[PDB]
Every structure is written in C-alpha cells, then in structure tokens.
Design a protein around this ligand. Structure first.
Ligand code: HEM
Ligand SMILES: [Kr]
Ligand SMILES: [Kr]
Ligand SMILES: [Kr]
Length: 148
C-alpha cells in the first residue's frame, strides 16, 4: 500500500529522537486539555502546572512508553490485528487511571500537530490522512477496554 510507506517514511524522521518529539506531543496535549494534567499521579502527588511534568522522571518514562507503542503500530502497519489484544488491555488500564475515551481524540490532534511541526512541507495531506487512519485503528482497538 502507498499509505503504509508514507507512515514508515515519516516515522523514520521522528523516531530518531523519541523523547524530544514526544515532549512536543504532551506539551501540545496539556495546552489543549489542561484537565488531563492531574491524571499523572506519581507518589500520590499532582502536578500544578504543565511545566512541572517535564521535570518528573516517571512522566518522561511514560513519554518513552507512548513512543514505543506508536513504533509497534508503525512496525505492524500492514497487519494491526496482531496488536489488538495488547491494545484492548492498554485501554482498560487507561480507563482505570481515569482517562475518558473522548480525550484520545485530543491525543490524536496532538500527534498530528507534532508530525506537522517535525515534517514541515513533507507533511502532505496524504500523510495526514494516513496517520489519521492508523491512529483511528489504534483507538478503535483501545476503545474495547471501555467495553464495546
Ligand atoms: C490522556 C492521555 C494519557 C494519560 C493521562 C496516560 C496516563 C497513564 C498513566 C497514569 C499510566 C500509569 C503510570 C505509568 O506507567 O506511567 C499510563 C501507563 C501507560 N500508558 Fe498512558 N496515558 C495516556 C495516553 C497514552 C497513550 C496514547 C499511550 C500509547 C499509545 C500510552 C501508553 C501507556 C503505556 C504503554 C503504559 C504502561 C501500561 C502498563 O502498565 O503496562 N498512554 N498512562
Ligand atoms: Kr508537557
Ligand atoms: Kr499518541
Ligand atoms: Kr498511531
């Protein structure tokens, strides 16, 4: 497929420096939906401001975890049925920590922002569409962790 190749080629640029790029993703996320900030409770404590999260080793480890899941999806773009059970369970975990399913649309927009800003003119409307489709498929699998 041509979509699969657009995804693999664009990801190569981002996966070079996953923490730097995942930092952009989460900075954008908290700018759009500040109410996600209290859901990261490490040591029973809440971050006051978004910049507090960037000093937290546990938060930065979660950025790495995110980028690893996306890497797995890109690696398996031709057949995502293999990640399906893992993703359902990842959904259940996030439901448990208190993330609402509607917040994953904001995460998607933040991912697209991070890609747009990293790729500049190489972020074509075809590339956007491809990533939207891939992210949609990931979220569909995760959404089974909220039942359905
Ligand atoms: C609103 C968005 C999100 C919030 C508030 C959130 C929050 C959390 C929290 C609190 C944990 C448990 C503590 C930790 O391991 O750091 C967690 C675990 C995790 N999250 Fe997220 N997360 C979000 C989105 C995502 C996304 C989009 C992905 C991947 C695509 C992701 C992947 C993970 C993974 C892999 C774990 C470890 C799961 C395990 O216990 O095996 N998270 N997340
Ligand atoms: Kr952040
Ligand atoms: Kr993401
Ligand atoms: Kr994705």
């Amino acid at each position: 497929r041509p979509e699969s190749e657009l995804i693999r080629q664009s990801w190569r640029v981002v996966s070079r420096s996953p923490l730097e790029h995942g930092t952009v993703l989460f900075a954008r996320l908290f700018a759009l939906e500040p109410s996600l900030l209290p859901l990261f409770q490490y040591n029973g404590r809440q971050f006051s401001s978004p910049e507090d999260s960037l000093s937290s080793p546990e938060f930065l480890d979660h950025i790495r975890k995110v980028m690893l899941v996306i890497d797995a999806a890109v690696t398996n773009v031709e057949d995502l049925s293999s990640l399906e059970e893992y993703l359902t369970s990842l959904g259940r975990k996030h439901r448990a920590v208190g993330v609402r399913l509607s917040s994953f649309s904001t995460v998607g927009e933040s991912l697209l922002y991070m890609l747009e800003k990293s790729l500049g003119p190489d972020f074509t409307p075809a590339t956007r569409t491809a990533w939207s489709r891939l992210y949609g498929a990931v979220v569909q699998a995760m959404s089974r962790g909220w039942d359905g």
